[PDB]
Amino acid sequence: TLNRKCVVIHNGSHRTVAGFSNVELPQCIIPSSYIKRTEAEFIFGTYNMIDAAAEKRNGDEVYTLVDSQGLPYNWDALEMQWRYLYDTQLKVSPEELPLVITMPATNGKPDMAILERYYELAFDKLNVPVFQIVIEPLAIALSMGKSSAFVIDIGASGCNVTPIIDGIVVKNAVVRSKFGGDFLDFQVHERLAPLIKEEQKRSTDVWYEASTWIQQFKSTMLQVSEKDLFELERYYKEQADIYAKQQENNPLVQKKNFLFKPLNKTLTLDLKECYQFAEYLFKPQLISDKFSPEDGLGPLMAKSVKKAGASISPEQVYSLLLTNVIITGSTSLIEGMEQRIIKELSIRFPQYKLTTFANQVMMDRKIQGWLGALTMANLPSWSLGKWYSKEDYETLKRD
Amino acid sequence: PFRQDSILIIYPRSQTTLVQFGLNEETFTVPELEIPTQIYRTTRQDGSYTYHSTNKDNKAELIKPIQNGEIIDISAFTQFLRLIFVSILSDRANKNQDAFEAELSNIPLLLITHHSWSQSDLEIITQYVFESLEINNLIQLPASLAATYSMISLQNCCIIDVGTHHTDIIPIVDYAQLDHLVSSIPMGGQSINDSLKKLLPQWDDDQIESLKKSPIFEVLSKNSDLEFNTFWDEKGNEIKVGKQRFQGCNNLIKNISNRVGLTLDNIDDINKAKAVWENIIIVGGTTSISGFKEALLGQLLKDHLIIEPEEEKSKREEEAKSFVPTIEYVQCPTVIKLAKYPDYFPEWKKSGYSEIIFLGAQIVSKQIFTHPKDTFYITREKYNMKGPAALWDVQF
Amino acid sequence: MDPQTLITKANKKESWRYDWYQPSKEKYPFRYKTWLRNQEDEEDILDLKEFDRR
Amino acid sequence: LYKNHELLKLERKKTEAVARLKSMNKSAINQYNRRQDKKNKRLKFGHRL
């Protein structure tokens, strides 16, 4: 292998992952947001922010670095974050080592403008020697031994569906849902509000709650039902009637208990109410009358495959993609999720056999994007990736 | 390979450095060498630096290389290792004179590291050990792992290492230190001192430090029976004290606990998490304060245990007056425990386990160095091939 | 005895430096620090016992 | 001749990708097996202690 050690940085819209290419896990996972506390001042890091957030001090406000595109939109802040990472976590001059960072799949447009802002940050400001940009869905797929794959990423910003054929990304078939993890935070909060008393500028408390009890609730209460929930209900009812009538147990009546710490208070949901939260990802027409069933994850996956079949047979691409389905993302770890994504895919494409792949290790999908970039950085040849040097920048600067 | 006479363990910390050369073979002994962690740095006109054990003719400056556990001066730190290492060679070379053919012929080194050390620092140290000290075999063992290996080898646990000015919190899952969860709070033993100064204004520092180190200072959660009790100055002066001797540990205990909670809550595999919460390991000088560990446990329970809120439970029991099943929660921890100490290291039992990290290293080094497999340390072979980078092919 | 010679007589051979390196395919336009192997051409003592516990 | 020559040209890079992709897949699979190995040797050392 090569005589080098890279810094690997992944700026997700929710989490930021950083570490060196020579070890199996990242040195740090910190929030892709910061507190601006006021003479201004910028707080980064999971415990630093949760401490400051709990202080409940006026003028403290949380801002974000990554928009819903998965792309950085506040570049002055991003530099401060990178400085923070290099200074306090990796503890190395940014000038020494090659850098590997991620971008999300796009349709192609915002690409050049981003690349430029990265030149300015990597070169003008940090003095990085050289960097590679890997495309998240692509790296994750490669890290998994796959050159062609339908990559279904369910993160905080929403679902990102990306067909990848023979190492190439099909941009026009790239699809980004708007409903994911962060959406789930909103719904858990709005729904539980009356039991916990509670029912931008108030960003600090929203954030702190999202990062504390709401995060635990998601990891322990929510489940995704295997089949359209409204149907599951009608069925379980229809069956329940017969057990009852017959003599003279509906699974949705099981209760689940969550200790809510801030008030030392038990919150009990029935299994249906637990299934209900993720149902919105699949049938978002159930919150507002302003969402079409087509904004739901099932129709969306289908849409993106069909748009893959338009290249540039279809019942071949369909077959390729569907035998290499990759399910990934923090939110994809919610119990029942893989199976519903599968059921939802299988019924839009009955003629085909689906085979899906997913990291089964809890940690590794939360940071599978970073894991992907890592396996790119450990590729044995410098010729395997585009490596931008200070040169490239100079030459772009000409007219 | 290898002679047990020859195994050298060094455990450097901000104030002092525990050292041992040779393992006893019968049972493990608590390290007897404790060298203050500092070196003198004379500056020689023309720019360069020289390093001595004493202020040479009052010409040298006093460098303290490790602060808050972090290496702040990597050059003085390596010079300090050499100073220790050389001293050991001289000592043994006198006493026995055939030493260079026996005890000093192949010296493997185990260096206990701290979570905060750079990769850059770890590589430089590796280079120093192979190039300057001309040693041939090196393990760099993280402090956290030494801890878990001493504690009857725990796959999942949490280390709470209470220093003087800071406390490290370090979760271990599947025998791996979880770097992204690791952290320290800027708070430790001195906090007790500080709490006490506020409670006893007319005392001074040495008086307060003496109380903390006395038989009558404990954390509560027979001495506790007496309103007042007595203890003796560093200088033999008798001092009486009231309820203050059961105070001063609280602010620290609460701070550590809040941190432990946020940390373990970010372990993603709940099945791992349950295990960690059931193997809390507390280490460091402070922890030898009577009552301290149990008090810290008590607080983790009070703050974090998942269990039915008492009022809720009291209603349900009234209702049933007209047997109550246990409410099951989806969260962890429903059980919190301190990891069980091994009781079969007699010398260690005698002296307490505040420094048990070192026993971790005595065990690992014997394992590793008295068995052929070279999987967990850097050898000359390896150094010759990859250099300091060799280090990353034997991480645990 | 001379500390340096004590170091020399115990435990019985390359050396590495941490420096700029410029990979090739000829040479890529960029640099980066790494641990390179060198070519052919590239104080005191303390008394333990004070520090022994007693 | 023109068409055949340009097609062989396209394939020189068709084969190029066939390789690039073949070798990346190789590294990726090797890296994954190395993870698993480290994880195993670790768990094995622990369980021996």
UniProtKB/Swiss-Prot annotation, chain A:
Transmembrane segments: none annotated. GO terms for molecular function: chromatin binding; structural molecule activity. SMART domains: ACTIN. One of its GO terms (cellular component) is NuA4 histone acetyltransferase complex. Its main location: nucleus. InterPro entries: Actin, ATPase_NBD. Forms a heterodimer with ARP9. Interacts with NPL6. Component of the two forms of the RSC complex composed of at least either RSC1 or RSC2, and ARP7, ARP9, LDB7, NPL6, RSC3, RSC30, RSC4, RSC58, RSC6, RSC8, RSC9, SFH1, STH1, HTL1 and probably RTT102. The complexes interact with histone and histone variant components of centromeric chromatin. Component of the SWI/SNF global transcription activator complex. Belongs to the actin family. Present with 1360 molecules/cell in log phase SD medium. Component of the chromatin structure remodeling complex (RSC), which is involved in transcription regulation and nucleosome positioning. RSC is responsible for the transfer of a histone octamer from a nucleosome core particle to naked DNA. The reaction requires ATP and involves an activated RSC-nucleosome intermediate. Remodeling reaction also involves DNA translocation, DNA twist and conformational change. This is Actin-related protein 7. It comes from Saccharomyces cerevisiae (strain ATCC 204508 / S288c) (Baker's yeast).
UniProtKB/Swiss-Prot annotation, chain B:
This is Actin-like protein ARP9. It comes from Saccharomyces cerevisiae (strain ATCC 204508 / S288c). Keywords: Chromatin regulator, Nucleus, Transcription, Transcription regulation. The gene is ARP9. One of its GO terms (molecular function) is structural molecule activity. It is found in: Nucleus. Component of the chromatin structure remodeling complex (RSC), which is involved in transcription regulation and nucleosome positioning. RSC is responsible for the transfer of a histone octamer from a nucleosome core particle to naked DNA. The reaction requires ATP and involves an activated RSC-nucleosome intermediate. Remodeling reaction also involves DNA translocation, DNA twist and conformational change. One of its GO terms (biological process) is regulation of DNA-templated transcription. The keyword Protease does not apply. It comes from the Eukaryota. Present with 1790 molecules/cell in log phase SD medium. Forms a heterodimer with ARP7. Interacts with LDB7 and NPL6. Component of the two forms of the RSC complex composed of at least either RSC1 or RSC2, and ARP7, ARP9, LDB7, NPL6, RSC3, RSC30, RSC4, RSC58, RSC6, RSC8, RSC9, SFH1, STH1, HTL1 and probably RTT102. The complexes interact with histone and histone variant components of centromeric chromatin. Component of the SWI/SNF global transcription activator complex.
Swiss-Prot record, chain C:
One of its GO terms (molecular function) is DNA translocase activity. It is found in: Nucleus. Disulfide bonds: none annotated. Keywords: Nucleus, Phosphoprotein, Transcription, Transcription regulation. One of its GO terms (cellular component) is RSC-type complex. Its main location: nucleus. GO terms for biological process: chromatin remodeling; chromosome segregation; nucleosome disassembly; regulation of transcription by RNA polymerase II; transcription elongation by RNA polymerase II. Probable component of the chromatin structure-remodeling complex (RSC) which is involved in transcription regulation and nucleosome positioning. RSC is responsible for the transfer of a histone octamer from a nucleosome core particle to naked DNA. The reaction requires ATP and involves an activated RSC-nucleosome intermediate. Remodeling reaction also involves DNA translocation, DNA twist and conformational change. Present with 1550 molecules/cell in log phase SD medium. Interacts with STH1 and SWI3. Component of the two forms of the RSC complex composed of at least either RSC1 or RSC2, and ARP7, ARP9, LDB7, NPL6, RSC3, RSC30, RSC4, RSC58, RSC6, RSC8, RSC9, SFH1, STH1, HTL1 and probably RTT102. The complexes interact with histone and histone variant components of centromeric chromatin. Probable additional component of the SWI/SNF global transcription activator complex. This is Regulator of Ty1 transposition protein 102.
Curated annotation (Swiss-Prot), chain D:
This is Transcription regulatory protein SNF2. It comes from Saccharomyces cerevisiae (strain ATCC 204508 / S288c). Involved in transcriptional activation. Catalytic component of the SWI/SNF complex, an ATP-dependent chromatin-remodeling complex, which is required for the positive and negative regulation of gene expression of a large number of genes. It changes chromatin structure by altering DNA-histone contacts within a nucleosome, leading eventually to a change in nucleosome position, thus facilitating or repressing binding of gene-specific transcription factors. Present with 217 molecules/cell in log phase SD medium. Component of the SWI/SNF global transcription activator complex. The 1.14 MDa SWI/SNF complex is composed of 11 different subunits: one copy each of SWI1, SNF2/SWI2, SNF5, SNF12/SWP73, ARP7/SWP61, ARP9/SWP59; two copies each of SWI3, SNF6, SNF11, SWP82; and three copies of TAF14/SWP29. The chain holds residues 585 to 633 of 1703 of the full protein. The gene is SNF2. It is found in: Nucleus. Residues 4-49 form the HSA domain. The lineage of its organism: Eukaryota, Fungi, Dikarya, Ascomycota, Saccharomycotina.
